[PDB]
Design a protein around this ligand. Structure first.
Ligand code: ZN
Lengths: 325, 178, 213, 135, 82
RNA sequence: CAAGACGGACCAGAGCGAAAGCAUUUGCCAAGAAUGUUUUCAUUAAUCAAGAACGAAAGUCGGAGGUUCGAAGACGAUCAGAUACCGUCGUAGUUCCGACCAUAAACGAUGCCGACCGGCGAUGCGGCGGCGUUAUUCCCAUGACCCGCCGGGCAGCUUCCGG
């Protein structure tokens, strides 16, 4: 039972199920949540820290660089993989696990990548969210040593090698489906769903492609055969001359380019909380807006705000009295 | 069992999807209601169940999702599931003055102000949330606060400059035992 | 001082046999006071009943207006008087970047009912379309509208009221119009939006018994 | 006094809540709409013209009509919300919202909510001038 | 820009340009030899014909006028002449 | 049931027109830009004193009509001095038909015609080239989409062209 930091984040109190509860010091010392650290000082201390012998750390690295998951994982994730590999080696025979992982098979379909399949509340033609389902909805849910890995790249390389992986649910996981991003310029895949520029070529060209791995060791990857996805409509537009100084917003063309700091005031990026027990004594139903700072005058916005505006293509007609900051 | 259905327009589908967990968690936890999103009919469907604590929880959930779909922040409509004297009155801009074209456009502009400042300042005085859909104005707050907000907004879209409206709205707030 | 609800009486109002659910509900009438009868006080009451309250499997945005036409001893036999969409559905279908195509026909059934049919359709954005707007041209709109009138008039003038109202429950006319208009401009959400009574025939008793059972 | 129905099936009425810009009406009636059961406007509760339109008077009227319905035996209500319409404002005020909320609170089963407001196809001239209206 | 052989444009460049805006004007039309499926008679039809050209020995329509190029009837064959 | 009005949402920096202007279906009537053309005439053209046609709203003469709104006007409220604001009512008007009137922030506060001087992709119409998807896998052309080009349009963005 090797606990990833996802188990500690999720407060998965599964120490009673297993007895081989082991983990790295690095994964538990990197957590920045206060409630998790408070919960760490309360829990019964049966977990033990170790560091794997570095030889299996190499071996895990040479097949992760072959399975297409090496840029996605962290060093600590390689530590978790090496620790569960060594605990498998010490407890169970080593002939069970296989190397040189199997080639992916390709099968495309017609659905758009943004089709909201596998989102809980949604229903095409019953699928309801009951008070009985909230504890149930975690992920796709289906002997001595297991894992508590929630990142998909972890489960991908584990089920590729053949280690039995389990979840916050006690029963082990048989099937794992998710989404990845693939570049249509250099065809290199990333398991990080947040990232918008490619790791290899650096272009803003990653598009969503679904994957599913079995417990057997098979990875099969579903494309979308929809011509909407690969269409260059608003991709060529003329760009302004590059501007410097404290207030310049260049159009963000490379991943590691340097922006001037334009942060919101602490008053502006505060949202109203109504579940607080001191809310009803508060004067207003809502937090006051910031209209007094310098960033209010400079019209600084939250980075997440104004997203559907960006997906409108620049060579198009906006209304005649609006201005796009 | 009784249910309500709340429509979603096409510009409110993606906000409904990103903010979905923040919608269905307080409805099902603190009110104990069933909820789904019918994609074929494009309706948010809210249904009573065995675990509902009391009557008029489902009306609270309906007002919550309605305020979200009109364009309010999810936190400002969690204010609807919590509080009892919060309503929403809306009107078109041409319900006050017949405006056509660029005049109408300027009306929207001088509701909002530069950077949105005017809007925010009105929200700071009347303690309301205003949302300006395409030609339409929606206010959220208490009853007397909503009528103060309408007075300020209607003065803005029958011509008066924002400075006059600022002074009038602060004076009216002072005389209202605020 | 005197309560007038003691003098009132409760009657059952019932849907005809064309819908699954019969008992659409209850109805007050002040009793007979010699001069005016309790019967003719309720001879012309119109009921806005949604379709989900008449059949279980159908959709609830449609409303049938049923007019009561006889009373049979705490039963009120009702006949079809109209249909319209829910205004929420009407508000939801009118989106911006598309063409609204409306049409209307004054069509007479075989048994003497003169009806006015209104049909609305919307141009459909295609599955690989990138252009924001989905407008039809004026000749395409006229062709679509002409075929809409043709389909409705051909679908009503050859049938009696019972068959027509049985094809207004699932909107067979709508599916026919969606299929037939694809060769001009593909259509998105067509419905017979409204059905009116322009003319009724002379009242008969055996006809209502046929429509009821 | 009322219908002779078992405890299972509900006897529906139709509730016309009309939220004017000076008061609010509550008209419970038959499914046909022809004969009326109860109607309590906002001014039947507050003895001041200023608060005819408040959500408080709307709440009180909702309690009154709900009480009268349990007197005569109506258990469930369909609701038709309404504002003035025509040339004037189309969206119902907080009076109709408060009446709906408090009436749902007071033991009524609620059926379908429908907005029957007079939207014109195309309108006559507005009561205001060209110069504007509402202060 | 600032260096362009105006004298010898590429044939792609000339074929793109409007028929007047070429270095020397040249039409985009042609006289095509049409061949009726029934008879053996060779006929010449202008590619942007405006009339309904009839067969001399069959009285069969060959092409219909359109906004631009005349559309040939189904079954007729043709070759562009010289 | 009737009367007179008005054609919302769809409706856009979309279209059309010389401008004022123009949005319910259908039919008739005569016009019109653009595009296409290896058609015809062959300088017939540009800009225009004088002179003419059209010209929002309001207004004025005759007839018809009056639903809504509503200058004048009547009231009610309001004050050291209020005679405008506000509410209810309401006349001419607002609608039509025939005459007049010829003015607007009648605006791009920007004559018209011709030429040259950077880039870009959206859109409206017409034309051309081309894989594919669709008309329940369309049997052929054809419409709806998709990719590029050309021409005249309504606009936009970008630029240290030069002013
Ligand atoms: Zn790449």
């Amino acid at each position: 039972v090797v606990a990833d930091a996802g188990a500690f984040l999720r407060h998965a109190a599964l120490q009673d199920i297993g007895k081989n509860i082991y983990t790295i010091r690095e994964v538990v010392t990197e957590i920045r949540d206060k409630a998790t650290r408070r919960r760490l000082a309360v829990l019964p201390y049966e977990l033990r820290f170790k560091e794997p012998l570095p030889e299996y750390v190499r071996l895990v690295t040479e097949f992760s660089k072959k399975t297409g998951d090496y840029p996605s994982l962290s060093a600590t994730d390689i530590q978790v993989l090496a620790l569960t590999y060594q605990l498998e080696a010490e407890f169970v025979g080593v002939s069970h696990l296989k190397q040189e992982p199997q080639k992916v098979k390709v099968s495309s379909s017609i659905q758009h990548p943004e089709t909201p399949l596998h989102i809980s509340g949604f229903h095409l033609p019953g699928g309801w969210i009951t008070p009985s389902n909230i504890k149930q909805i975690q992920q796709e849910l289906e002997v001595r040593v297991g894992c508590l890995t929630t990142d998909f790249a972890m489960q991908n390389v584990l089920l590729q090698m053949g280690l039995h992986v389990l979840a916050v649910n006690g029963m082990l996981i048989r099937e794992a489906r998710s989404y990845i991003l693939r570049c249509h310029g250099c065809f290199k895949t990333t398991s990080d769903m947040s990232r918008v520029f490619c790791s290899h070529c650096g272009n803003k060209t990653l598009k969503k492609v679904s994957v599913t791995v079995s417990d057997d060791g098979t990875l099969h990857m579903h494309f979308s055969r929809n011509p909407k996805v690969l269409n260059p409509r608003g991709l060529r537009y003329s760009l302004p001359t590059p501007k410097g100084g404290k207030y310049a917003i260049n159009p963000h063309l490379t991943e590691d380019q340097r922006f001037p700091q334009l942060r919101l005031s602490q008053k502006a990026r505060q949202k109203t909380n109504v579940f607080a027990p001191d809310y009803i004594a508060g004067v207003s139903p809502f937090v006051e807006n910031d209209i007094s700072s310098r960033s209010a005058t400079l019209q600084v916005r939250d980075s997440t705000l104004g997203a559907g505006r960006r997906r409108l293509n620049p060579n198009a007609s906006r209304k005649k009295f609006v201005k796009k900051r | 069992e009784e249910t309500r259905k709340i429509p979603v327009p096409a510009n409110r589908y993606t906000p409904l999807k990103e903010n979905w967990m923040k919608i269905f968690t307080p409805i099902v936890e603190h009110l104990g209601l069933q909820i789904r999103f019918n994609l074929k009919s494009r309706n948010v469907e809210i249904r009573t169940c065995k675990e509902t604590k009391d009557v008029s929880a489902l009306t609270k959930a309906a007002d919550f999702v309605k305020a979200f779909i009109l364009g309010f922040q999810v936190e400002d409509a969690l204010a609807l599931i919590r509080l009892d004297d919060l309503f929403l009155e809306s009107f078109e801009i041409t319900d006050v003055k017949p405006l056509k074209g660029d005049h109408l456009s300027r009306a929207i502009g001088r509701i909002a102000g530069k950077g949105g400042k005017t809007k925010f300042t009105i929200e700071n005085v009347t303690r309301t949330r205003i949302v300006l859909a395409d030609v339409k104005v929606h206010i959220l707050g208490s009853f007397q606060n909503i009528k103060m907000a309408r007075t300020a907004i209607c003065n803005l879209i029958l011509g008066n400059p924002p400075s006059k409206v600022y002074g009038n709205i602060r004076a009216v707030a002072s005389r209202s035992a605020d | 001082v005197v309560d007038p609800f003691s003098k009132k009486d409760w009657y059952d109002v019932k849907a005809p046999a064309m819908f699954n659910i019969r008992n659409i509900g209850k109805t007050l009438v002040t009793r007979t006071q010699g001069t005016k009868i309790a019967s003719d006080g309720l001879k012309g009451r119109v009921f806005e009943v949604s379709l989900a309250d008449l059949q279980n499997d159908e959709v609830a945005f449609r409303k049938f207006k049923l007019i009561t036409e006889d009373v049979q001893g705490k039963n009120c036999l009702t006949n079809f008087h109209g249909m319209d969409l829910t205004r929420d559905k009407m508000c939801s279908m009118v989106k911006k970047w598309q063409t609204m195509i409306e049409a209307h026909v004054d069509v007479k059934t075989t048994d003497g009912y003169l009806l006015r049919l209104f049909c609305v359709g919307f141009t459909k954005k295609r599955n690989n379309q990138i252009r924001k707007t989905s407008y039809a041209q004026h000749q395409q709109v006229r062709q679509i509208r002409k075929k809409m009138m043709e389909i409705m008039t051909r679908e009503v003038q050859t049938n009696d009221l019972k068959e027509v109202v049985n094809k207004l429950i699932p909107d067979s006319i709508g599916k026919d119009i969606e299929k037939a208009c694809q060769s001009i401009y593909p259509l998105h959400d067509v419905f017979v939006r409204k059905v009116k009574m322009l003319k009724k025939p002379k009242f008969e008793l055996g006809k209502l018994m046929e429509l009821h059972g | 006094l009322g219908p002779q129905v078992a405890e299972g099936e509900n006897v529906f009425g139709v509730c016309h809540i009309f939220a004017s810009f000076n008061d609010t009406f509550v008209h419970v009636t038959d499914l046909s709409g022809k004969e009326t059961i109860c109607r309590v406007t906002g001014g039947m509760k507050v003895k001041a013209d200023r608060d005819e339109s408040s959500p408080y008077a709307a709440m009180l009227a909702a309690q009154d009509v709900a009480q009268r319905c349990k007197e005569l035996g109506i258990t469930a209500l369909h609701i038709k919300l309404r504002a003035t319409g025509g040339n004037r404002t189309k969206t119902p005020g907080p009076g109709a919202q408060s009446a709906l909320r408090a009436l749902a609170r007071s033991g009524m089963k609620i059926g379908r909510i429908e907005d029957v407001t007079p939207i014109p196809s195309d309108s006559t001239r507005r009561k205001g001038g060209r110069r504007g209206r509402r202060l | 820009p600032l260096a362009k052989d105006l004298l010898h444009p590429s044939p792609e460049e000339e074929k793109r340009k409007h028929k007047k805006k070429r270095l020397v004007q040249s039409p985009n039309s042609y006289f095509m030899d049409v061949k009726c499926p029934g008879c053996y008679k060779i006929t010449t039809v202008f590619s942007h014909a405006q009339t309904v050209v009839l067969c001399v020995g069959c009285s069969t329509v060959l092409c219909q006028p359109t906004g631009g190029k005349a559309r040939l009837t189904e079954g007729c064959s043709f070759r562009r002449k010289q």
